[PDB]
Every structure is written in structure tokens, then in C-alpha cells.
Ligand binder design. Structure first.
Ligand code: HEM
Ligand SMILES: COC(=O)c1cccc(-c2ccncc2)c1
Ligand SMILES: COC(=O)c1cccc(-c2ccncc2)c1
Length: 411
């Protein structure tokens, strides 16, 4: 029996996500068609013109695709499953210059070098300064009495995480943050005038300038470890470091921001959990926040050969779209998936992707950013209560909140 969905329903349809998360639709697929052909009419495939894709809705299937990188390619069509319908193919393939959209062995070499910048020591060295700024962010917001939680609480700390990871001087962080903000949301009317391409170019130019300067003055930021050759001569060229900085500016910003915003939306909806958090400050909360937020609704892969997955024949060349939003609520993996439980432990969510070659390198940095900001929110604005409904972001694969008016004082 076919799944009870509207005819022509596209799970990457930005017009859906601008209003709601299609939670019931995902649940219907999990029950009636866990791997389902998502057809797309001509010119309505968000940049891809192959007629549709396989909607992947079960956690285990998401994990199987993520593990079998040899079959399910990121490079072939990139991992973002939706752009503007009119995007030029070359503007998709230019994104192959970032680690996210590479296959082995190119990806293998790159992740090995980049790993130097995300060692636990490198991230943990940001703990104290981010905790400081986190406390300052919440106190300044709380003093304002009320405002947009997205902008006064959620936005800054992720941007400062990136800046501190790269050693960007404070005088440059403004433009870094603007470049980062200019690379997501171009399908939402509020961001119709942003130019992700131009900001990428400028960012590359800034990053390459930074690489040659950090070569003359070996600091202790990751930049020196990345452009310094190891015993086998492996390092990032100046342009390779340019693309890595582009990768960081886009990845390190809005996903964590929307985790924070939707973490708090969850807390306002689940007072018992908010109360529990304020007393125990459990760090397991960060993972339940990411599972609940699933800031990346979906990433895609392209099959390099015929492959049978859970009884369905994936054909060579076809796209499979991993709906993390569905997998993170898989009744077969989670006890009470639709209960918000900040003590959930273990929490094998795929908010950071399925385990495999492309698993989020910023996972523990994002977790630390979330734990720090929610401790600060708990310290400074514990009686926060919302004022109006969040404004959702029009995107086909990102789960975003543009705005959320909250009373920080509590009334
Ligand atoms: C809550 C915040 C975040 C979420 C939800 C998230 C989500 C994801 C997901 C789902 C993947 C898997 C990609 C795939 O398998 O195709 C991924 C990979 C990646 N993440 Fe994140 N991420 C977050 C934070 C960050 C941060 C803070 C950084 C950098 C500071 C970062 C950098 C990356 C990179 C570079 C990759 C690609 C790694 C590779 O291809 O080897 N992410 N992320
Ligand atoms: C928003 O897309 C990107 O994140 C991206 C990724 C890789 C490369 C480029 C790029 C390279 C050269 N010129 C313009 C853009 C952009
Ligand atoms: C080419 O990449 C992107 O345009 C992009 C845009 C938004 C978010 C992310 C992201 C965030 C966290 N982890 C991995 C990727 C990437």
C-alpha cells in the first residue's frame, strides 16, 4: 500500500519547511514505506534533473549509507539535496572543493590534515574563552529584558567558536561573521539578496592572505598546524586552506545556532526538562538538543553502483537522501522518540550524520558550544518565556529558525 502522502509531495520542498517540520509525513514513510521514491517533476528538483531520489527514513539505513562511502558518493552530486531550481550545474560542482563533498582518496588525505585542527586538545583549549563569552552573551541579552532569542542568544557563540578556532583577531571577526552569514538561506525571501558565491570568493581571499601570514608568524591556532608540513610533506596549500575556511564558516555557524534556538523552544515546551536542566545542568542535554533540533534535515549521496538496501534496489547513479529528521525519531532505535529527555543515554542520534568517513568533525565543538550557552541561559535568564511563535527558515534541507521573540525576565 502506497504511503498516505499528498500527490507530488517532495520531502525537500522548501515551502514545507518555511512553515513546519513534516513530522507526520516522515512517520508515515517509516511505517508504510521506509525507503520511498520521492519523485520530482521537470525543473522542480532543486538543481538536480534526474526525476527524483530515494527518501531514506530509518536510522539503520542512514547508518548503512554513511558507512558504505565506497558505494554512496558525496562528490558525484554533492551532499546538499536542494538548491534553487535554476542553479547552474557548475555552481553545484564548485562545492566539490570542500571536504564535505569529496570522496576518497582526496577526502582521506584532507580529513587527515584537517584533523590536526579539531583534536580534543584544540577544541578544549577554547573551553574557557567560550564559557566567558557565553556568560556575557546571556547577561547582555537578559539586561535587554526582551528580544529576538535567535539574534541575542543563539547567534554569537558559534561564530566566536569558529573565530577562536582559527585565531581570527577580534577586529576581523565582524567581517568573518558577515561572510559566514551570507552563505545560507538564499531561498528564504528575507535573505533573497545574499550572494553565497561572492562571499565564498572574498572568504577564500581573506583565508589565503591569512595562510601566508600565519606561515611567517607561526602562532598556536590550528592554521599553523594545517599549513605546516608533516614528516611526509602533507599540508594544506593556501587555496586548500581557503576552502577549509569556507567549510568552517558555513558549517560552524547556522547549524549550531539552530540547535540552540530549538533547544530552548524544546525547553519552553517541556518545563519539567527545563527545570531538570537548571538544577543538574546535564551535558547529555546537548545531544538530545541536537537530536530534537536535527539542524541538518537531510544530506544526500549518489550511488556509484547498483546496491540493495533493506530490500530496495538502489540503481547506479541514483540519489539517496538521508532524512536525519526522520531517523532521529526512529521508534526502532529510540525509546519514546517523541519524548524530549535531556538525560537520554546512550543517544545514538545521527544529527551529526551517520558514523563513517564524513562524520561531523565539529561534533564535540558544537556540543561544547551548546552546553556552555545553555548553562549561561540557565544562570542569567532562567525564567525565559516565549512571546510569539518562531519564524521558520525556508530551506529544503536545513531546519532553521530566523526569529523568536522571548521575554528574558519571565514576565
Ligand atoms: C549542531 C551542529 C552541527 C550539526 C547538526 C552538524 C551536522 C553535520 C552532519 C550531519 C555531517 C555529516 C555529513 C555527511 O555525512 O554527509 C557533518 C559533517 C561535517 N561537519 Fe558538522 N554539524 C554541526 C557542527 C559543526 C561544526 C561546529 C563544524 C566546524 C567547526 C562542523 C564541520 C563539519 C565538517 C567539515 C563536516 C564534513 C566532515 C567530512 O566530510 O569529513 N560541523 N556535520
Ligand atoms: C556556498 O558554496 C560554498 O560553500 C563553496 C564551496 C566551495 C567553493 C566555493 C567557491 C569557490 C570559488 N568561487 C566561489 C565559490 C564555494
Ligand atoms: C557546502 O556546505 C554547505 O554549503 C553547508 C551549508 C550549511 C551547513 C553546512 C554544514 C553544517 C554542519 N556540518 C556540515 C555542513 C554546510
Amino acid at each position: 500500500p502506497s504511503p498516505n502522502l499528498p500527490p507530488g509531495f517532495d520531502f525537500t520542498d522548501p515551502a514545507i519547511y518555511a512553515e513546519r517540520l513534516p513530522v507526520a509525513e516522515f512517520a508515515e514513510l517509516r511505517s508504510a514505506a521506509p525507503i520511498w521514491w520521492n519523485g520530482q517533476d521537470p525543473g522542480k528538483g532543486g538543481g538536480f534533473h534526474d526525476g527524483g531520489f530515494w527518501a531514506i527514513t530509518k536510522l539503520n539505513d542512514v547508518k548503512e549509507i554513511s558507512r558504505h562511502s565506497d558505494v554512496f558518493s558525496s562528490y558525484e552530486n554533492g551532499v546538499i539535496p536542494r538548491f534553487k531550481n535554476d542553479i547552474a550545474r557548475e555552481d553545484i560542482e564548485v562545492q566539490r572543493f570542500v571536504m564535505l563533498n569529496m570522496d576518497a582518496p582526496h577526502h582521506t588525505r584532507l580529513r587527515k590534515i584537517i584533523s590536526r585542527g579539531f583534536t580534543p586538545r584544540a577544541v578544549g583549549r577554547l573551553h574557557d574563552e567560550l564559557q566567558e563569552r557565553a556568560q556575557k552573551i546571556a547577561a547582555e541579552a537578559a539586561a535587554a529584558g526582551s528580544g529576538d532569542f535567535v539574534e541575542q542568544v543563539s547567534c554569537e557563540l558559534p561564530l566566536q567558536a569558529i573565530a577562536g578556532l582559527l585565531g581570527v583577531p577580534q577586529e576581523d571577526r565582524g567581517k568573518l561573521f558577515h561572510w559566514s552569514n551570507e552563505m545560507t538561506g538564499n531561498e528564504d525571501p528575507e535573505y533573497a539578496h545574499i550572494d553565497p558565491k561572492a562571499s565564498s570568493a572574498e572568504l577564500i581571499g581573506y583565508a589565503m592572505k591569512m595562510a601566508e601570514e600565519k606561515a611567517k608568524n607561526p602562532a598556536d591556532d590550528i592554521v599553523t598546524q594545517l599549513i605546516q608540513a608533516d614528516i611526509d610533506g602533507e599540508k594544506l596549500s593556501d587555496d586548500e586552506f581557503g576552502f577549509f575556511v569556507v567549510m568552517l564558516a558555513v558549517a560552524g555557524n547556522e547549524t549550531t545556532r539552530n540547535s540552540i534556538t530549538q533547544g530552548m523552544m524544546a525547553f519552553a515546551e517541556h518545563p519539567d526538562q527545563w527545570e531538570l536542566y537548571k538544577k543538574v545542568r546535564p551535558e547529555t542535554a546537548a545531544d538530545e538538543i541536537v537530536r530534537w533540533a536535527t539542524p541538518v534535515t537531510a544530506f544526500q549521496r549518489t550511488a556509484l553502483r547498483d546496491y540493495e538496501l533493506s530490500g530496495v534496489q538502489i540503481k547506479k547513479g541514483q540519489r539517496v537522501v538521508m532524512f536525519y529528521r526522520s531517523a532521529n525519531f526512529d521508534e526502532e532505535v529510540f525509546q519514546d522518540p517523541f519524548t524530549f529527555n535531556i538525560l537520554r543515554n546512550p543517544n545514538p542520534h545521527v544529527g551529526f550524520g551517520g558514523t563513517g568517513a564524513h562524520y561531523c568533525i565539529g561534533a564535540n565543538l558544537a556540543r561544547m558550544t551548546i552546553n556552555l550557552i545553555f548553562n549561561a541561559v540557565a544562570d542569567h535568564m532562567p525564567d525565559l518565556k516565549p512571546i510569539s511563535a518562531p519564524e521558520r527558515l525556508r530551506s529544503g534541507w536545513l531546519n532553521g529558525i530566523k526569529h523568536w521573540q522571548v521575554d528574558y525576565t519571565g514576565r
